[PDB]
Design brief:
The PDB classes it as de novo protein. The two termini are 25 Å apart. This protein has 4 helices and 7 strands, in the order βββαβαβαββα. It has a single domain, classed as Glutaredoxin, CATH 3.40.30. It is globular.
């Protein structure tokens, strides 16, 4: 396990922990064996409707194959996630989201959650024109061993990921 001070030494998502939307600390080692889409989310974004509905559909169709969705609210892009964790939970419930919802974090800057600092420097987690998260709804695909295998930008709808999933199931 690694923390905010030694995140660069991690070799896997599984070495991290994060508070869920209810305030409870979750050890991400629980995702061993599962293929995960890790994404930064926001309620008041033009991308919100398509991304949430397609993530719900992917989770519904592939949950039994091993797909998990880890949703990290983040208010750093246009202040498009201004609400409380309680409000965000209720917003997600309106989509019938059964994935895993975490407490609001930062994804860029010195205060970014260590998992996001680590994802951004992985060989398959590098961005276009620098590694910073560019907007809400960046997606990292994580394999069963906790390694980053692909990064998709804000404009790549979750259904684009579907063709890449079977290889990891």
């Amino acid at each position: 396990h690694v923390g905010t001070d030694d995140w660069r030494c991690a070799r896997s998502m599984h070495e991290f922990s994060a508070k869920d939307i209810d305030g409870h600390m979750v050890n991400l080692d629980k995702y061993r064996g599962f293929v995960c889409i890790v994404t930064n989310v926001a309620s008041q974004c033009g991308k919100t409707e398509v991304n949430y509905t397609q993530l719900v559909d992917l989770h519904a169709r592939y949950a039994e194959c091993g797909l998990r969705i880890l949703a990290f609210p983040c208010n750093q892009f246009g202040k498009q996630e201004p609400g409380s964790n309680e409000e965000i939970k209720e917003f997600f419930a309106g989509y019938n989201f059964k994935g895993d919802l975490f407490s609001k974090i930062c994804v860029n800057g010195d205060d970014a959650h260590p998992l996001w600092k680590w994802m951004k420097i992985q060989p398959k987690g590098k961005g276009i024109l620098g590694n910073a998260i560019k907007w809400n709804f960046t997606k990292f695909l994580i394999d069963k061993n906790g390694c980053v295998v692909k990064r998709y930008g804000p404009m790549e709808e979750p259904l684009v990921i579907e063709k890449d999933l079977p290889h990891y199931f």
